[PDB]
C-alpha cells in the first residue's frame, strides 16, 4: 500500500508520495526510459490501495487498477464506494471485501460523466494540497451532490500526477493555497492514451509518431507533437499505458 498524510505535508512529501505510487505499479519494459504498464494481471495482482489522511486525521482508502492507474472506488470506514462501470464491479471482487455497506455510484469514472455530474468543468475546479484535504473530507462524509467534484480532485491529485511530472509538480507546489488548472494540464490529461500509443509506435518507427498529438503548452498555444525528442516525451510523461488497453 502507499500512504499520504496531509497534516504536515510539504512539496517534498507529496513528491515522495507520487514516487512511491509510481513504484507500486508493475512494468516489464521501459520505452525511452518510461515505464510501460502491463496489459493484463490476475485479480490478486491487479489492484493497489492508497491511504489518504486529511488535516482532521480522517482517512479514506482508494483502490487503483495498476494496469491503467484508474481509480476504481474508495472506502470510508465500513462503507465502500465503486464507480458504476464494468471494471469497477470486477474490482469489487478483490478489494474492500470486509466492508459492511457497498454503494455503487451513479456514474462511471470518466471525466465527461463526472463533469456533468459535478456541473463544473475541470478548469474551474481548484487543485492543490488544501483542495485534496477538502476532497477527502467530502468523500469521507459522503454527500452525493459534492462527490463528483471531489472525485475529480482525487483523480487529478493521484492518477494524473502519477502519469505526468508536470502535473505532480504543479499540484505539489500548492501546499497552503489552491489553483485552477491551465489548459496545459487539461490537454495532458486528455492525451495520455494517445501519447502512450504513439510512443510505443515510435519505438518501432525510428522515434517518429505515426499520428501527431496536439497539446496545449504553458503559453496556451496548440503545439503538434510528432516524435520522442519532444519535451513532453523526454521530460514529462512518466508512465505509458500499454497499447493493449488502447482499443
Characterization of the model:
- This protein has 247 residues and is an alpha+beta fold.
- The chain folds into two domains: 1-162, Ricin (A subunit), domain 1 (3-Layer(aba) Sandwich), CATH 3.40.420; 163-247, Irregular (Ricin (A Subunit), domain 2).
- The protein contains nine helices and ten strands.
- The strands form three sheets. Strands 1-4-5-6-7-8 form a six-stranded mixed beta sheet.
- A hairpin with a 4-residue loop joins strand 5 and strand 6 (70-76).
- Helix 4 (111-118) packs antiparallel against helix 6 (144-163) and helix 6 (144-163) packs across helix 7.
Net shape: globular
Beginning-to-end CA distance, first to last residue: 30 Å
Instruction: Give the biggest beta sheet.
Output: 6 strands, mixed
The CATH class of the largest domain is identified as Alpha Beta
SS strand fraction: 15-25%
Largest sheet strand order: 1-4-5-6-7-8
Helix share bin? 25-40%
Task: List its traits.
6-stranded mixed beta sheet; monomer; 247 residues; alpha+beta; monomeric; globular; ribosome-inactivating protein; Ricin (A Subunit), domain 2; 10 strands; 2 domains; alpha-trichosanthin; Ricin (A subunit), domain 1
How are the secondary structure elements laid out?
Layout: E1 2-5, H1 11-23, E2 27-31, E3 34-37, H2 43-46, E4 47-53, E5 59-65, E6 70-76, E7 79-82, H3 86-91, E8 101-104, H4 111-118, H5 129-140, H6 144-163, H7 165-172, H8 183-202, E9 208-216, E10 222-227, H9 231-235
Parallel strand pairs: 1-4, 7-8
Antiparallel strand pairs: 2-3, 4-5, 5-6, 6-7, 9-10
Helix pairs in contact: 1-6, 4-6, 5-6, 6-7
